[PDB]
């Protein structure tokens, strides 16, 4: 089935925001390991592949539809100190979720409402789960100090 | 069996600072998963739990005696951070002790053994179990300082 | 995250409901039981565990907005027999129903499509689960008459 | 193997005749189940399933012969209170197993014994299970009254 | 509860579409198997029970919303080779996505958002695993031949 | 108890013709297996097997009629090529269908309504199994070749 | 420990590789999967794990020598059939095998012996692995045509 052309270029644009998404979480995962912080090594890297799996659905959605996956993921920006990852991580995860929104909008407007219904499924995942925690451990390294906070996470 | 209308209308004085307590617990315990401190949850969704089984055997009795149960909560009363939080819930817990233990004195003036044997149960629930928790966690903040004590509750 | 005022409030506004329509089965399936219909008592009782649910869903999701959340129950209304309680939850779910499709609206408007997903899963819930249940009862009562109808809760 | 058109034929006139009688439990059951007598909705769900495999029986046997299944299921009638929609489907099982005993006579008459013992089946289940059920369920309507009636199959 | 005369009438049109999509699942199902091809009988049986869970939701649907069920099949199409088959399961699965997609718009206009749900679960099973499988099987025809293509679903 | 003379005689022809089906089938299904068509030797291994069973029903029956059965098999004329085996094993279930179904006709007219039913088993398995399966493989052979066919039969 | 700067320049040209490595397999398994060839799917679906793991291997090798990852991949390359794609992967693994080898080259010159170990691992699964099933599957395209090969990976 064709799809609308408008929507497969959207989802596109998503696409390759969350093979970003994957990739910066793959670096900051290992950093944080190579640091020996390994409850955030598995925190991220879970994450890393649950953007995999965005990126599948997207990616599969792509081609049910006709459509060219484009697979050039967004460029990243991984921080250097645990502050700057998490705070790095969530204005990707802050940029993800406007745009995941703007896609639902877009996506309704041209009656693709599987479309719709996956990407809503992405938002829950990234305001709920994903920003949610990032939130979380900035707020928890506010209330007892950085330092605490990183002896938290060994 | 109709029950003694002094004592009906005390119990439901019971019952509405019961189903307060729980809606308190239910904010704090909530307000404390936001910030990431599940620990502070899992207790709190647990008192929670046992104030609506305190406010459940309060209302099976009124309705054993032939009563009406009043089910408007009591204002409640949140804190804004962890340690106004902990005061808040010990200055409701106070309040209830002393409300049980007026409530034993009527129902043994009124010859209402089982009524007074209830409210003796859940006085000892409040005494022992969460009254006496919470001057814990106030005690541990004093004793390691806040910081420390927020560390160990994530 | 900060969601749109008028979101908050709005959640606010079915936050209160749902802690009333909790409490109003609480006290109905209490009465149920009081007169000896278990299976009365039983499915209100499951009815109140899963308005707590709705109401736990509802507050989660405004504090991860940034709101604060009410927690003053509306008033509730109990009936007195059996037919006018289940009367009185009829006409509670048939306000929960219209509530949350306002609700629906006002996130789909405001873009707030996550929070537009919860309510749909709750509105679903109301029609299908527990208005249905009562419409169905007040049709046996019709059917086979009260008296049979309220032997065959026991 | 060419069957014999008349058989083919005939059987086809059964196969629309199951279609419709599946259709008509179908929405039977369905009703049963709306207004709370799931006892009704469990029999004649079961019921639906049976006249489907009946249907199978028949549509593969017309392709085993060479012949082309008519696929338009009867017109269906169903019943707008408990009492109709008994006596509907009795009518109709009636009708089947009138059209089931002709078939047996002319598949007898063309030599086709094994369609003749695929309908003996069928006129079995007719009778014995189908048709009786429903006499039984009208019976018992006349010996209790409708209003217990209908209490027992809550 | 009284739904929109509108959406019932809409929920009608899909439910006796669904309906026939079930039956030409039944026929063309059993073709398969007559000539021996039992991977797309296994296939396409699985698709009439899918559809046939499809109608009943529907029914169910429109039976809460206080409507009739319209239970006359649409008319079929069936194929008389395997790639008609195959074209004409297609298109009655391109016939279903669009009336299912106009139901969707057509529900979030009159507010019901319970019935838009149900469509958009229905619409995903339409796009993502009929049509689509469909779609996979004309591919592989065209990829490695008609003869092979048969010989694989032996 | 002695049958009728016409019975025992006819079922005395029909078990040599059984004899003679489980001697073809036991001579292909040992070619089929010796050019490395695993596939056929299983499924005519089967049907020798099975003819063998006929066989012995006839025989047993004959005996207890006070006959003496009649051990010569028919003829055979086994195939050299799979196309012409197919095709010699589909004229001999066509005569023995035809011969099962005058043996039932003549049990029916000497009132002998035991060995009818049994003829009436066979002849189901002669239309339903042996002779359907291979028109299924003549049929595949003519729609996706006779080289994709023998590879599939490996 | 600081690492040789030529050696972890050249892990990073090696990371990129594998990056692009795992993401063209990304796009070409899902390509095979939307065509319905399974195989082809779960094989690179392995692949693509497989490249994940080993671009995995160097970027924690690089940050144990005190370098940065580079996380930008190499361009892809994507067929649009399926000896296309064969061919494609086929030329990068050749390109990855002759980048592994002058990195072990590399790593023995600079005496980085754990380095050249784990480049070493890598080699030997290009080779014996990857590129070794790719040239297999052409060459079975070679000796069997290409619409056999393509319905064995159904
Ligand atoms: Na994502
Ligand atoms: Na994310
Ligand atoms: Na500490
Ligand atoms: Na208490
Ligand atoms: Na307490
Ligand atoms: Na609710
Ligand atoms: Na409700
Ligand atoms: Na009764
Ligand atoms: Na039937
Ligand atoms: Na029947
Ligand atoms: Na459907
Ligand atoms: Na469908
Ligand atoms: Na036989
Ligand atoms: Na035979
Ligand atoms: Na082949
Ligand atoms: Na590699
Ligand atoms: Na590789």
Same mark, same amino acid.
């Given at each position: 089935?064709?799809?609308?052309?408008?929507?497969?270029?959207?989802?596109?644009?998503? #696409?390759?925001?969350?093979?970003?998404?994957?990739?910066?979480?793959?670096?900051?995962?290992?950093?944080?390991?190579?640091?020996?912080?390994?409850?955030?090594? !598995?925190?991220?890297?879970? =994450?890393?592949?649950? =953007?995999?799996?965005?990126?599948?659905?997207?990616?599969?959605?792509?081609?049910? #539809? !006709?459509?060219?996956?484009?697979?050039?993921?967004?460029?990243?920006?991984?921080?250097?100190?645990?502050?700057?990852?998490?705070?790095?991580? #969530?204005?990707? !995860?802050?940029?993800?979720?406007?745009?995941?929104?703007?896609?639902?909008?877009?996506?309704?407007?041209?009656?693709?409402?599987?479309?719709?219904?996956?990407?809503?499924?992405?938002?829950?995942?990234? !305001?709920?789960?994903?920003?949610?925690?990032?939130?979380?451990?900035?707020?928890?390294?506010?209330?007892?100090?950085? =330092?605490?906070?990183?002896?938290?996470?060994?």
């Amino acid at each position: 089935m064709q799809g609308h052309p408008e929507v497969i270029d959207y989802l596109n644009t998503l #696409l390759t925001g969350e093979l970003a998404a994957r990739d910066q979480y793959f670096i900051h995962s290992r950093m944080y390991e190579d640091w020996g912080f390994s409850k955030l090594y !598995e925190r991220l890297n879970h =994450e890393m592949e649950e =953007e995999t799996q965005h990126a599948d659905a997207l990616l599969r959605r792509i081609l049910l #539809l !006709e459509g060219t996956p484009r697979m050039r993921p967004d460029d990243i920006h991984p921080g250097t100190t645990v502050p700057e990852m998490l705070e790095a991580d #969530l204005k990707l !995860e802050r940029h993800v979720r406007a745009a995941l929104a703007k896609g639902i909008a877009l996506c309704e407007q041209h009656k693709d409402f599987v479309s719709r219904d996956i990407l809503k499924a992405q938002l829950a995942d990234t !305001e709920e789960d994903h920003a949610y925690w990032l939130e979380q451990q900035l707020g928890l390294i506010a209330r007892m100090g950085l =330092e605490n906070y990183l002896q938290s996470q060994i």
